[PDB]
Design a protein around this nucleic acid. Sequence first.
RNA 1: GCUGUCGGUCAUACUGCGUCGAAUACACCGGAUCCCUUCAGACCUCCGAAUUAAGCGGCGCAAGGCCCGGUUAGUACUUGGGUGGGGGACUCCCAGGGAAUACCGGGUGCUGACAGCU
RNA 2: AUAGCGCAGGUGUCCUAAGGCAAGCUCAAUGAGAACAGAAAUCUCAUGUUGACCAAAAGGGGAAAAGCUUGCUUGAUUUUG
RNA 3: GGAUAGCUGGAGUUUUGUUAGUUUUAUCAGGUAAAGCGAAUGAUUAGAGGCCCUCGACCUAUUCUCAAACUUUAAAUGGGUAAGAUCCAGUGGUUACUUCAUUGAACUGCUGGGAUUAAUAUGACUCCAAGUGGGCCAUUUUUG
Lengths: 49, 129, 154, 193, 261, 166
Amino acid sequence: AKSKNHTNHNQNKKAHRNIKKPQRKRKMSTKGMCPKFLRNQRACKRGMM
Amino acid sequence: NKATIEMLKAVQPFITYGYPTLKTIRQLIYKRGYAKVGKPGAHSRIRLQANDIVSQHLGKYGIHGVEDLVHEIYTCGPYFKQANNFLWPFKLNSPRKGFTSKRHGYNEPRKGDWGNREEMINELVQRMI
Amino acid sequence: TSFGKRARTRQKFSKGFRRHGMPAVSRLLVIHKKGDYVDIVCDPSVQKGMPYSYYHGRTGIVFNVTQRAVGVEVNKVVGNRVIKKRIHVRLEHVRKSRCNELFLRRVKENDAAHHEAHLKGESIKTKRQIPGPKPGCFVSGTMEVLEPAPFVES
Amino acid sequence: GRRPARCYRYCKNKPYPKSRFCRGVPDAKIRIYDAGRKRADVDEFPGVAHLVSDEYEQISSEALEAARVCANKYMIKNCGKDNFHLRIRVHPFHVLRINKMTGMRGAFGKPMGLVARVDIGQILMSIRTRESNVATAVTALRRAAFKFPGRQKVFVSNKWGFTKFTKVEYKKQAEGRIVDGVGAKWISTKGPL
Amino acid sequence: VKALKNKAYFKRYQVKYRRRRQGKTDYAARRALVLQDRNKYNAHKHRLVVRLTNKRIICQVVYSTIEGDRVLATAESTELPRYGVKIGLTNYAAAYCTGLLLARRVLKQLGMSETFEGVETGEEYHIEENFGERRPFKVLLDVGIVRTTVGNRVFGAMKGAADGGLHVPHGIKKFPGYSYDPEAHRARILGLHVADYMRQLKEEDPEKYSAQFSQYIKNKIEADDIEAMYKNAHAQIRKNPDAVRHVKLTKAQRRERVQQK
Amino acid sequence: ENPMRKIRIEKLTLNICVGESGDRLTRAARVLEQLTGQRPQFSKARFTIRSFGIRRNEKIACYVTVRGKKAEDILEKGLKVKEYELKKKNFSDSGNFGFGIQEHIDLGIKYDPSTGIYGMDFYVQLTRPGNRVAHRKRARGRVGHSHRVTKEDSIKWFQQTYDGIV
RNA sequence: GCUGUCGGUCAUACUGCGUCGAAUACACCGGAUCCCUUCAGACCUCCGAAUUAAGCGGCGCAAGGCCCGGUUAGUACUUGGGUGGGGGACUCCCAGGGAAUACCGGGUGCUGACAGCU
RNA sequence: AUAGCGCAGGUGUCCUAAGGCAAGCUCAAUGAGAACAGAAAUCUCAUGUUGACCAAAAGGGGAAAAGCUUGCUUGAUUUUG
RNA sequence: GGAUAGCUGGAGUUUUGUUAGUUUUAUCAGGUAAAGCGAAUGAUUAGAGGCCCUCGACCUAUUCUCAAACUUUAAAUGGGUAAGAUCCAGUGGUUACUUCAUUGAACUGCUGGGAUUAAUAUGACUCCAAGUGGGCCAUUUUUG
């Protein structure tokens, strides 16, 4: 006994009730950078110790 | 500003605005003037009975007396933003002779209410005190 | 409906009018240092590395530069939250952004303006002014008397 | 049994013309649009009267056929065959659906027939004729209004034949910018030479 | 019939760039050369540009910028009357001599002449050599739209650059003598095929030998003398760098011309 | 440049078009071999027709292209069959005229047992010097309207050279 | 003021037709022994040096195209408000934003690197 | 982002080439021409902004190519993120 | 009917020149409404002008009316990013990366320059769990 297939009603109102923005952080994360590049950032950091 | 005009376009039919005069500004701040007092979180809303409340909060900027607010609002000084946000927004009673019809604009020949009256808000607000 | 990598693309991925053929060489000689803004516009002429349709026309920060691609961090609402998403994309599909360039000019003049006072005691308070109310002057010229118009059908 | 035309007054749906998608072709009842003397030149037949809708409607193809056969028969009796031109301007390109007889499910329906959409201020008919006539030609389009639904104002325009040009602006002809039947063509200073 | 080129044809008609319309640049091969990755950022990819016109061989080192391409040092075969070689400017020998004469004055400009002597003839050579030290100057080869056969003059000027000590990457497979024979390539550099044709043709005919090679008779150069010139040209090069109507009508003037007609 | 604007024969092409592939065709290819001194190429059928009776890619016909010094000798002996006479139709709009002949057996050579009997098309071209500019790889362009050969230009050439009538 | 090589914008730069180009220079152009290419020295390749006709460049055309502005027009359309109008279809006022052809007034290019020429 | 037993159609495959790379070439169509030959065979010039073609639905994209023809090959390979 | 996320409560903390369902300043993306057919594609009425006719042909310039699965052009309303203490410049070092090259690149040490660098308002994680997963209506948009 249908019944309603789909709706977007009250979904914007639900989302805005709480639309959190991620906190900004210094120093960019390196996940997904080149492995060749990130090899030479380890060799860089070693050389100043 | 240009900014604060283009905000008021969006709100118009919930609002009746316009240009004050030195009579209506004096009457607001003397009769209905309250002042917000405290840290971010809680401010208290205190009645303007003496200048020492005004003095301690706005004594940075000049503005020692209640009469020096009235200059800074009427002229629009460099320290308007500070002196305006000091004042807790005014709480007016309903106008003695009523409105016409809050559906319609102050323009239109049905004589309604919303929108901006260039000067004639002064005649309204003197009844709402 | 139907979901495909390029569904409803039609008008969106169309090359343009009289704009057919491959990218020019001067647009392919642009450099992109990481920590820099770029608008992702995808041209259908090159099918290699084109981004997904949602990211088309989105500005975001370059985090990586692969040899033949640019890692761009853009951000994306998913109901309750923004989430920063990391999308690689071919060099042709990236434009240089021009969104920051007023601010970049501004700091060079503004930092040099604060610098040069020194012993005059700075306190300039450098700031844009939004064009609000005009002051008054007298004005005079040739006139015309208009009246309202009678109706005509035509 | 076709429907009553109160069913299909209003422009409820997007245009759905006969294309490769529609395939069910019902063919129209107007395949003769122009009437009277077709072939008269522009120097004759300066006067004109339009029939103009004030109302946003659909009009069936049969109602256009009915109206032109009404109007040209009024011309033939009064002012002869060969002192008028009568154009139908509106065409029916919108195709019109019927579902006919679980109640729904198969609700989308076959193409019944053709119909023409019509704006406010849009011109339906236009009689081009001599300035002698006109008053007869108005009363040809008071008649033809009764075949359509809604109201249509009748409108004597100020223009020479079927042209842009005002009949003031036509006669200043002598200088020889203007030179074709049912279409006064403007010779431009634009070239070549 | 409907006939060619409608009014509405020109409305639709896109144009190819201009040096495709003019018939010069291949923009397919240009995009492959000019790219230099984004790991490199702001390095400049240099390329050798050899172009065979009539009577003359231009040879340039070029990198690209957004405003346009930018020439590092030019060379011409019309210079070679300085360095001994009077005539035969178009040939394979002169192509080798131009590519050598270019390759020195890249190095002298940078200040890198004493390093990279290179290898003076026609034997195979790459620069793997020099270790623990500064790497040789990298430069590609853009033929343009010269059609790339075995021989042709362009890979003469490539081998001229390799002698000079520019790091050109190249296989051996489009040199003459090919399975490879080095001494056949030495014949083409020193102009031996040119001398052998004159040696063949003079005993056959006087009329062909007058008609061709009229400049050789003026400048007094024999069949024996050719191999001396292009050898002695090299030592001359390696102690040397280079050393120096109608107009438009207005619209007042145009409507004037109408009433004349 | 009045000397260099002189008309010359750009090229001569010859085309035998046959029924079928086999010993029919390869026999006919040997006729153009001994005549010209060059092996023919072999054309193929682009699509099926069936009324005549061929299908896709059957290898139907052959042709050959001749140029310079040889091409004057074949053309002058070829027109000696026609007795130096052609029609108004024969000359094309672009200038490049042509004609037909039956019987290679009476155009030199010999009638033979298994060389047999054929005809051929016998098509000529006429342009001036500077026709490199269309066909060259680098720096293409049109040969413009003043320099280009018309129909009526080609007729005046053929009246003088070989003493022709149209 | 120009010519060449590599380009940038990619029609203000394209296409058609017609006249004129000092000097380099591009170019047509002459040849097939070797390198090399085919049915074919036309293309391509190699070795050459006995006419501006074309290519190429400038200019013209009551040219087409293209680009730019004015009209079209505060019109079409449209955001927020209405216990506005109208039987409906639709339409008007208030506070705002605001197009596109048709048609005539002007245009037909500008430019970086390097080597040379009145 | 977005529904219906809304609308028009499609898939359970096909291919050592229709995969990969490089080179050369330009397509559909029209116009004027050439023995047998025409409305359709093949050859030739002129014009040809894609009006063809790219395994198949529909849509994007493509002209010294992504199309057609030839040469050489197996990156339709291995290691896991 | 569940599971899962969201909406909700409670229990703890971190923490106050940082947040925003808003505009402005500058910069991008888009192909709806309208408009278009003397612009392509598709539909369509009318005539003009191009061995005796003849309506044809087709071409050339015009004309009547159109398109959810046509488009040269193209709004309003909405969407993205940026507007400094998580910044800007100068100078030295580290590096198997990159370069023809202390040329670059990213990261770091020090030394200057700068306190809120448009408007308006304003203090801004972790855990545990409930109920709920039949919805209906109205103005404008809209499909059968």
